[PDB]
Amino acid sequence: MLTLKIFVYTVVTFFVCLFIFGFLSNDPARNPGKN
Amino acid sequence: KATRGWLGGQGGAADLDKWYGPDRKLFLPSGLYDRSEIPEYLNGELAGDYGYDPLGLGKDPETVAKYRENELLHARWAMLAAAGILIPEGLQANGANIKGGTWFETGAEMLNGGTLNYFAVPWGI
Amino acid sequence: LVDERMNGDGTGRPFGVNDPVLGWVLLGVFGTMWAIWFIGQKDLGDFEDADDGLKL
Amino acid sequence: LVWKAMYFGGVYDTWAPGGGDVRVITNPTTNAAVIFGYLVKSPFGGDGWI
Amino acid sequence: EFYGPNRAKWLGPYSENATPAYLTGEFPGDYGWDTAGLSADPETFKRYRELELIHARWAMLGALGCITPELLAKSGTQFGEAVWFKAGAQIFSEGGLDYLGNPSLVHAQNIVATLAVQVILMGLVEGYRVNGGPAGEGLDPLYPGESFDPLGLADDPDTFAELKVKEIKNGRLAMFSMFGFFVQAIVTGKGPIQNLDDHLSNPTVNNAFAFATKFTPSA
Amino acid sequence: PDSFWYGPERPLFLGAFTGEPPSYLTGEFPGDYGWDTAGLSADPETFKRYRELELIHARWAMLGALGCIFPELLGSYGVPFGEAVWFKAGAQIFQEGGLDYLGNPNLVHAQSILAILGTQVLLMGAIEGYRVNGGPLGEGLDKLYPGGSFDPLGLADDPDTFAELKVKEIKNGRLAMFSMFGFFVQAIVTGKGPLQNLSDHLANPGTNNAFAYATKFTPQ
Amino acid sequence: EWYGPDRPKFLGPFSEGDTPAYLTGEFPGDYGWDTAGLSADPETFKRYRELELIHARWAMLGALGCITPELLAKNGIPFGEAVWFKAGAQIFAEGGLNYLGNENLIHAQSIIATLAFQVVVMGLAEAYRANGGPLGEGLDPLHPGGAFDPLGLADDPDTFAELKVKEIKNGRLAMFSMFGFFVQAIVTGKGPIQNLDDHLANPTAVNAFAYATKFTPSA
Ligand code: CHL
Ligand code: CHL
Ligand SMILES: CCCCCCCCCCCCCCCCCC(=O)OC[C@H](CO[C@@H]1O[C@H](CO[C@H]2O[C@H](CO)[C@H](O)[C@H](O)[C@H]2O)[C@H](O)[C@H](O)[C@H]1O)OC(=O)CCCCCCCCCCCCCCCCC
Ligand code: CLA
Ligand code: CLA
Ligand code: CLA
Ligand SMILES: CC1=C[C@H](O)CC(C)(C)[C@H]1/C=C/C(C)=C/C=C/C(C)=C/C=C/C=C(C)/C=C/C=C(C)/C=C/C1=C(C)C[C@H](O)CC1(C)C
């Protein structure tokens, strides 16, 4: 039953890290406007 | 006499325009005290001049210097007096047997045939 | 005891970890993602100059 | 606030023996683990976070 | 004497050929003793000279500050702990550290705060020494003078050189004595003044050879 | 080069109080903070030998710090090592079961110290002979930065990145050597593992610090 | 062979790839081992050579003086104390220190008298060595010859050079062995001959590793 906990923790951590590092990747300069 | 700053960098008097000259600090802020109402004899020459003279006790520069003499003498005597009022009481209250204690009681301690103990901070009493 | 349980619902363990393998997994995944981001940082442009970035 | 609770009077401890009363916190819990356990604790029932 | 070619040497009369070529009696306390040849390079020689001077001054201060409290305690002043190698542990006493035993002086009870204050102040002053500070900037690294010579005891060049030689000799003696302090404290276990008193009590038996077998490696 | 860590504008080891660094420390080598107060690098040959010594010491101490920290952490988490503490791991070979890697009886399972010493002597002698004089993995390469077969991932092609990574390597190595000196002193004084010392300090920082042992070596 | 660019080195086949440039090979015992770069300056190189040779001769004498009494005692000579590192305490014995056991030889009792005599004698001798005295002046600092070579065994320059190589090699071996003596006395606590006998008794069991946990930190 602990293997399920490990798997869920891994998946959640991977997705949360993706979210966190996505917005650190120069997100504000992704707009289509001219500046 | 070439020196450096206490925390590194160039050493000197920093900026002296805060205390001297037409631009300086005053006893009231800019919005409440325009530079026009400063008395003509209160120019940025003497040290610690905040343009403070209600009731116009000073009249002209030589009287200002005459009163400056008294102000400086009083200031130095008051510095010595504040030190000599604060230190002995704190020394006595912390264990030392000064025998004088509070300033307003030290005088009577030497009345009659009584004497006074003198503490040499570093060294004995 | 009839059966076995994790027994950690009300214990309030930090980050909900009661076995060191969970903390190791957390740190490993975070470190791998951070390393990938650090390697790819060169393509995001460097903000070395003092005044840079989106502003108004 | 810390000085008020520690030196100038005290704070109303409601867990004092009998009915609670004003007490001086002579030994605040400065341990890092105990202090930072609250922040990472879960917010759901039984734990309640801070 | 003490300068030039015909100066005092580390081997007395039997020293004509002992002195190295690079030691020419230009700097104070130059007895021509470099048997190991560690200062052939002039830059390294200058660095070693600076290190020697700083060590000598610190050793002077250390020797005086080791002697004074023990003698004062012998005079009848309660220090709490007068022996030099035990005087640091009284910061942990219930009464704290009191200067000369008077409870109203210093009365320090926290060691971390004292260490932090010492770190900050000593860092600032050592940095002032290295590069210059409030006292001055463009002065000699070892003999700044000016603000550090208020009485003006060093103004005539020959007197200045003689005073420098006296300084270096007193400093070498102080360094030797402080090394003796360390070794005696490790071996004997009592204060240096107590050691001197014990030697004067019975010199023939109260010497170093009484502790020769202390560190025998028998096992 | 033209970077923050090279040239006359490089950071120095005393901040603004450093003054002018020694002339021979012109600032063309990694981790040059101009700290040679003792004047031990006046001769350029001696300077080069000291640089080589510093780099080798740095690499060895980085490896040593990592290898001192990791097994104790694993043993604290629950792995059944024979002796998790770094300064006690050598005595595992005298145990009845011998040295067991990761605590497993089927991993290594060494029994004799003499064989370990002999094979280590042979292998390390060959290794260091190859390091000093070129061997199978490159012949005409730099003594300190051979590259080639020792840089498979190609992280040092760009000279600017090469200099930056050299500075990073030397800084991390100096930190590791400082920490290893700390390891030695703490082992001599406290007598517990470095992680045990860290845990004790974290439990009660006010009292569980170095000064608690200050009166440990006083003569009597 | 020996002097020359094609000389044996300290790393065998791995040495010719990297050797110091200042170690040409004009001096005895030049195996090209200066990895630390401590002899870049020729003057410091000369001083280090002098120090090395003096240590070599002293360690030769020390090795003989450490071995001979223990072997003689094993043969059955009644010595006061065979082990070298406990031989100094014989002066404190009630019967005094006697050469070869017999009380009619030397029969020394006081340590101060012998120490003072040694100090004076060795001071004169070492001053003469450093500067030059009755036994020749201005000679070779390390190999004076002359009155110090009564047998004239090194008149032929090539034989003289070969004997110099033999001297330095035997001296390096002696210094290594004396360092071993010091470490073994510190660790084992028994005489070197006792160590050899014990190792020969059970070579696999008793060795250095047996005293591996000797200095493990306490607490
Ligand atoms: C003419 C005789 C004469 C002799 C022989 C010496 C010799 C010496 N002088 Mg010199 N001097 C002499 C005349 C003069 N000196 C000086 C001025 C000076 C100065 C200012 C200095 C010297 C110093 C020295 C010493 C330098 C070498 C050294 O450090 O020894 C080291 C080696 C020994 C002392 C021999 C070892 C001692 C003993 C025999 C061995 C002890 C055994 C232990 C029991 C070992 C046990 C420990 C175990 C556990 C390992 C040396 C003792 C220096 C000095 O004293 O530094 C220490 C120094 O600073 N001299 C003057 C004034 C012009 C002299 C006038 O004639
Ligand atoms: C070809 C193989 C070869 C190798 C590998 C060596 C290597 C060596 N030779 Mg050389 N030689 C070799 C061939 C030859 N040598 C020589 C002639 C000489 C001479 C005359 C000398 C040497 C010396 C040396 C040593 C230099 C010291 C050193 O580098 O320390 C690095 C080595 C170590 C640090 C050894 C470490 C051993 C072990 C792995 C570590 C011990 C672990 C401990 C348990 C740690 C415990 C910690 C404690 C302290 C708390 C070194 C062992 C010198 C010497 O003997 O000095 C000692 C020396 O004087 N050699 C000749 C004749 C031409 C050779 C012929 O091929
Ligand atoms: C989520 C909540 C969890 C609980 C709370 C945890 C709190 C933790 C607080 C501390 C860490 C906060 C980190 C926040 C994210 C922001 C990181 C960031 O913006 O970081 C941005 C910066 C950018 O760095 C700069 O990056 C630049 C660009 O580099 C590139 O260019 C260079 C040449 O110019 C070189 O070529 C280089 O190689 C190349 O990458 C330069 O290199 C600069 O020198 C360099 O300073 O990074 C840096 O600040 C340095 C790295 C910072 C610390 C990162 C730690 C990561 C974890 C370490 C342990 C992992 C273990 C894994 C184990 C796996 C196996 C089990
Ligand atoms: C966020 C608060 C704030 C800030 C940033 C400023 C900033 C400024 N004020 Mg304004 N001011 C404030 C509050 C503030 N003031 C308040 C509350 C009053 C009413 C008393 C005034 C009345 C006032 C006048 C009449 C004038 C200024 C002027 C100025 C300017 C220069 C002089 C100066 O620093 O003030 C000087 C203010 C003082 C000396 C007041 C005493 C402040 C001391 C340090 C007490 C601090 C208390 C403590 C730190 C905080 C208490 C916390 C809690 C109890 C609330 C400067 C831009 C001058 C100006 O711009 O001229 C054109 C000017 O003429 N201020
Ligand atoms: C660098 C040298 C050095 C060092 C590290 C120490 C360190 C120490 N000393 Mg020692 N000491 C030294 C030199 C040194 N001393 C010398 C040269 C003297 C002779 C004056 C003394 C005399 C001395 C005494 C008598 C006592 C100590 C004590 C102490 C301890 C408390 C430190 C403290 O609170 O002082 C900081 C104290 C203050 C800031 C209060 C003001 C004291 C001022 C600074 C004294 C200045 C003296 C003056 C400049 C020189 C003498 C002038 C004279 C010729 C007229 C500490 C272990 C005390 C101790 O623990 O006893 C064992 C103690 O009772 N020291
Ligand atoms: C104090 C003794 C001493 C001294 C002064 C020297 C000095 C010298 N040797 Mg010699 N050497 C010694 C001992 C010594 N050696 C020993 C014991 C061995 C056998 C291992 C050798 C073997 C040897 C060879 C094979 C060669 C030299 C060479 C040299 C010269 C260049 C190396 C150098 O800079 O040394 C400077 C030395 C010092 C500054 C001494 C510092 C010593 C520190 C304190 C460390 C000592 C303890 C250390 C940890 C011991 C580790 C080994 C241990 C197991 C014994 C120089 C003249 C080379 C040369 O050019 O020949 C002329 C050369 O080819 N030596
Ligand atoms: C700069 C300068 C300048 C001036 O002028 C002068 C002066 C001051 C002199 C100088 C300084 C210097 C210094 C500081 C030095 C230091 C060093 C060090 C510390 C090193 C270490 C170093 C250190 C090191 C290497 C370390 C190493 C380690 C090791 C190997 C380890 C190993 C191990 C491990 C893993 C664990 C296991 O269980 C066991 C063993 C096996 C044991």
Swiss-Prot record, chain A:
Please report the name of this protein according to its UniProt entry. Answer: Photosystem II reaction center protein I
Coiled-coil positions: none
Could you tell me the Gene Ontology terms of the biological process aspect for this record?
photosynthesis
Q: From which organism does this entry originate?
A: Chlamydomonas reinhardtii
Gene Ontology CC terms, in alphabetical order: chloroplast thylakoid membrane; photosystem II reaction center
Q: Which UniProt keywords apply?
A: Chloroplast, Membrane, Photosynthesis, Photosystem II, Plastid, Reaction center, Thylakoid, Transmembrane, Transmembrane helix
Transmembrane residue ranges: 4-24
Q: What is the annotated role of this protein in its UniProt record?
A: One of the components of the core complex of photosystem II (PSII), required for its stability and/or assembly. PSII is a light-driven water:plastoquinone oxidoreductase that uses light energy to abstract electrons from H(2)O, generating O(2) and a proton gradient subsequently used for ATP formation. It consists of a core antenna complex that captures photons, and an electron transfer chain that converts photonic excitation into a charge separation.
| Localization per record | Plastid, Chloroplast thylakoid membrane
Swiss-Prot record, chain C:
Stromal-facing ranges: 41-56
Which parts pass through the membrane? 20-40
Compartment(s) where it occurs, according to its Swiss-Prot or TrEMBL record: Plastid, Chloroplast thylakoid membrane
Q: Which residues lie on this side of the membrane: Lumenal, thylakoid?
A: 1-19
What is the similarity comment for this entry?
Answer: Belongs to the psbW family.
Q: What does this protein do?
A: Stabilizes dimeric photosystem II (PSII). In its absence there is a reduction of monomeric PSII.
**Quaternary structure annotation from Swiss-Prot or TrEMBL:** Part of the photosystem II complex. PSII is composed of 1 copy each of membrane proteins PsbA, PsbB, PsbC, PsbD, numerous small proteins, at least 3 peripheral proteins of the oxygen-evolving complex and a large number of cofactors. It forms dimeric complexes.
List the protein's name. Photosystem II reaction center W protein, chloroplastic
Originating organism: Chlamydomonas reinhardtii (Chlamydomonas smithii)
Per UniProt, what is the name of the gene that codes for the protein in this document?
A: psbW
Swiss-Prot record, chain D:
Its annotated compartments are:
Plastid, Chloroplast thylakoid membrane
PTM field? Phosphorylated in vitro.
Q: Show the stretches that span the lipid bilayer.
A: 4-26
Judging by the UniProt lineage, the source's domain of life is: Eukaryota
What function does the entry list?
One of the components of the core complex of photosystem II (PSII). It binds chlorophyll and helps catalyze the primary light-induced photochemical processes of PSII. PSII is a light-driven water:plastoquinone oxidoreductase, using light energy to abstract electrons from H(2)O, generating O(2) and a proton gradient subsequently used for ATP formation.
- Stated family: Belongs to the PsbB/PsbC family. PsbC subfamily.
Q: How does it assemble?
A: PSII is composed of 1 copy each of membrane proteins PsbA, PsbB, PsbC, PsbD, PsbE, PsbF, PsbH, PsbI, PsbJ, PsbK, PsbL, PsbM, PsbT, PsbX, PsbY, PsbZ, Psb30/Ycf12, at least 3 peripheral proteins of the oxygen-evolving complex and a large number of cofactors. It forms dimeric complexes.
The name this protein carries in UniProt is Photosystem II CP43 reaction center protein
Species whose genome carries this gene: Chlamydomonas reinhardtii (Chlamydomonas smithii)
Boundaries of the shown chain within the full protein:
163 to 212 of 461
